[PDB]
From Swiss-Prot:
Organism: Saccharomyces cerevisiae (strain ATCC 204508 / S288c) (Baker's yeast)
Gene coding for it: TFC6
Subcellular location: Nucleus
Further remark: Present with 1130 molecules/cell in log phase SD medium.
Described purpose of this protein according to its UniProt entry: TFIIIC mediates tRNA and 5S RNA gene activation by binding to intragenic promoter elements. Upstream of the transcription start site, TFIIIC assembles the initiation complex TFIIIB-TFIIIC-tDNA, which is sufficient for RNA polymerase III recruitment and function. Part of the tauB domain of TFIIIC that binds boxB DNA promoter sites of tRNA and similar genes. Cooperates with TFC3 in DNA binding.
The name this protein goes by in its record: Transcription factor tau 91 kDa subunit
Subunit structure: Heterodimer with TFC8. Component of the TFIIIC complex composed of TFC1, TFC3, TFC4, TFC6, TFC7 and TFC8. The subunits are organized in two globular domains, tauA and tauB, connected by a proteolysis-sensitive and flexible linker. Interacts with TFC1, TFC3, TFC4 and directly with TFC8.
Amino acid sequence: RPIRLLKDLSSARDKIERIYGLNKEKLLLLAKVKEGFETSVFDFPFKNIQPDSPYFVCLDPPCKKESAYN
DNA sequence: AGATTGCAGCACCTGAGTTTCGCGTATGGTCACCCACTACACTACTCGGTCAGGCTCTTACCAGCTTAACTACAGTTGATCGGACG
């Protein structure tokens, strides 16, 4: 297909592979976020951001990646 | 596992935000024409002085006389004048 404007990505699965690629470990996070927040229209369950949640997802900013003070 | 049903994918008609546009309406700009005012040199008719022409008025008579005044001769006294003073 000549996928060149947003309207060419008509199929939902085609949109996700075109916008997010096929790295299996990356696609997990999208499935977790979808199930953990689809019903969260204006607010989300406290139980979903907790470190033990079945839907827990957390990406640390690059400044946190290793100790920087020294 | 079939009769009932939803998802959602395909295609084509459609709708607005956005744009480009045409005109109104009106405004500053070109430039062409012809007008007003000015003026140096000129055109030309009249007025004016001068002159002649020639018609015109007014004089004053000649010698004499006879009505009218001067116009000379003539004598003691002025006061500027010269030229020298203060």
